[PDB]
Ligand binder design. Structure first.
Ligand SMILES: Nc1ncnc2c1ncn2[C@@H]1O[C@H](COP(=O)(O)OP(=O)(O)OP(=O)(O)O)[C@@H](O)[C@H]1O
Ligand SMILES: Nc1ncnc2c1ncn2[C@@H]1O[C@H](COP(=O)(O)OP(=O)(O)OP(=O)(O)O)[C@@H](O)[C@H]1O
Ligand SMILES: [Mg+2]
Ligand SMILES: [Mg+2]
Lengths: 328, 328
């Protein structure tokens, strides 16, 4: 079968946007592809991470991957840093990416937007992500609309390497969901929901308690119409709430518009909170199971073992193409 | 004893500048320090390297290190790429260096001087070099005047890591020779002699034949005075030739000025060529011995083995400080 790779940064607790845009689809994709799902801790340090928080976040992410249903025997779950090949191939890839291609990345300009001093890692985020994917001869990359431009660069980089040194890389393809590819901030409907937003009201983590989810849905930005109908341009907050409601409940935006005819934001929000709470319920239960056992560490050990075998061999192939080191 | 680290890029065949400014001193330093001498192949790919040339250059550099007298039992001779920790610590260090500190590096601006598209590796050269040094708890760094600014950044980076996460790194110190720290191009006395200069007349490689050394010394830029006397500002080419003559022969600039009183550039250059040829003679002989045996590969295997033990443990310490991966 074809191969899949996809990473999530342990830069905070994953949100419903992360879930809706990517994680949710991993669970189904694992049975039809050879999958590598990564906890990208090296990507997470491109900005300040408290060391204790990062360690904890790394373990929580792994538990949540398994809690949503990733089966360690059907897919390879691992931590980026535990596979030296990602840093190796990242170095090689940054000697072929042009500085201008990095500065033109919208994620770079956005995250670097209005900062005096910024880490080089923020800028060199792309070559590492390109290595993450390219290392496993990945065919499909399940994301995550905001990740489209990175995958496009990654393709340019694999092509440049292939034509410069010889055919080595499979050109990967992004797989972005038709629905939920871009869940918006609850607090600023013009920005996507980010797990690292400085405002906790912007997102709902997969670990949020009922009380917390009710508050967050209640504080969500809407408008003064009091009319539940989808209109991304005119009613951004309400349209986003409808999207969340629609993908989580399985009802169409249109069905929800009818069901809420004659209502009623208070009631619409109260209902949506319960829908999110009910979705997160079985997930949180299994998360607690994984968090309290050493089984989590066995899954990760075995996952890094398999990833190392595949990746270090690609690295060897890459060094042989570039002329690095010695003949092996 | 204290520890030493120093690298040389296998980006061409080392020159007499490389020799005079660094390699020559490694031979004496090895008996008084714990030394790690590196063949930095990952630094070499920051610009285009022909894969066959790079492979060959890597093996030639190792043979020349040993040919000048580095004793594999007194020092650790290794190839950068063969120790994954350099790429690992390089990634971590680039998440702490600021983009502005990289753009202000004069080597960056020089090598990137007048180029439309440039590799990110050119820009991120410093974090990798900082990792190279920091990995081994290096106290002294023998270079290489042009390398002073990199070592200064490396110190800022170790200090930033130490104060941000906890004391881990030894603050390294540059050790630049009083004489020969900056051998100039034979063709452009305002630029340093570089092994990768697009003009082969600029430098004399340690592998150049007698005929080639005579031509290069003969074509060396001088002036219209016909007076052999040292004057860096007024007589840059002649002063550089005097410097080369002085460090290689063991005579003072002043002794040479007297000995050449009443002469005589033709004769001065003819004499200097023979001095270089006579110096390179015993070196080239041993170089051919190493090139034709598998002993060269045993030295490198053992050198990477020792370097891996030390470096991967520093990497583990670094990840533990930043919170990467899992507790080990
Ligand atoms: N708002 C969103 N809607 C749908 N998918 C999203 C959203 N935000 C992120 N994703 C997807 O989630 C995955 C994990 O990405 P990532 O770890 O960068 O999350 P993040 O929330 O954006 O975190 P951070 O704020 O630290 O950068 C990717 O496939 C990504 O495109
Ligand atoms: N002209 C020179 N005079 C004295 N020392 C030098 C000179 N050029 C380089 N060195 C020293 O040689 C060592 C190896 O450096 P490096 O491998 O960068 O050589 P390079 O000739 O400058 O190569 P390249 O042109 O590929 O960058 C360092 O210690 C460096 O400072
Ligand atoms: Mg992100
Ligand atoms: Mg150099």
């Amino acid at each position: 079968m074809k191969t899949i790779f996809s990473g999530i940064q342990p830069s905070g607790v994953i949100t419903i946007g992360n879930y809706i845009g990517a994680l949710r689809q991993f669970v189904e994709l694992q049975h039809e592809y050879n999958c590598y799902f990564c906890i990208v801790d090296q990507h997470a340090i491109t900005v300040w991470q408290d060391p204790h928080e990062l360690r904890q976040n790394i373990r929580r992410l792994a538990a949540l991957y398994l809690a949503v249903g990733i089966d360690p025997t059907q897919a390879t779950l691992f931590i980026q840093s535990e596979v030296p090949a990602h840093a190796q191939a990242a170095w090689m890839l940054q000697c072929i990416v042009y500085i201008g291609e990095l500065e033109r990345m919208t994620q770079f300009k956005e995250k670097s937007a209005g900062k005096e001093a910024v880490s080089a890692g923020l800028l060199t985020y792309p070559p590492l992500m390109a290595a993450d994917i390219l290392l496993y001869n990945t065919d499909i990359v399940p994301v995550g609309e905001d990740q489209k431009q990175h995958i496009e660069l990654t393709r340019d980089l694999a092509e440049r390497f292939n034509k410069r040194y010889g055919e080595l890389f499979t050109i990967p393809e992004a797989r972005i969901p038709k629905v939920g590819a871009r869940i918006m901030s609850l607090v600023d409907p013009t920005k996507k929901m980010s797990k690292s937003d400085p405002n906790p009201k912007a997102y709902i983590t997969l670990l949020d308690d009922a009380k917390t989810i009710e508050k967050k849905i209640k504080s969500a930005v809407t408008d003064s119409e009091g009319t539940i109908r989808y209109d991304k341009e005119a009613k951004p907050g309400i349209s986003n709430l409808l999207n969340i409601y629609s993908t989580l409940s399985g009802q169409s935006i249109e069905e929800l518009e009818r069901q809420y005819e004659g209502k009623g934001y208070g009631v619409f929000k109260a209902d949506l909170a319960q829908v999110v709470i009910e979705t997160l319920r079985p997930i949180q239960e299994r998360y607690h199971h994984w968090m309290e056992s050493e089984e989590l560490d066995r899954v990760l050990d075995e996952g890094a073992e398999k990833a190392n075998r595949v990746a270090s061999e690609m690295v060897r192939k890459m060094e042989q193409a570039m002329g690095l080191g010695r003949r092996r």
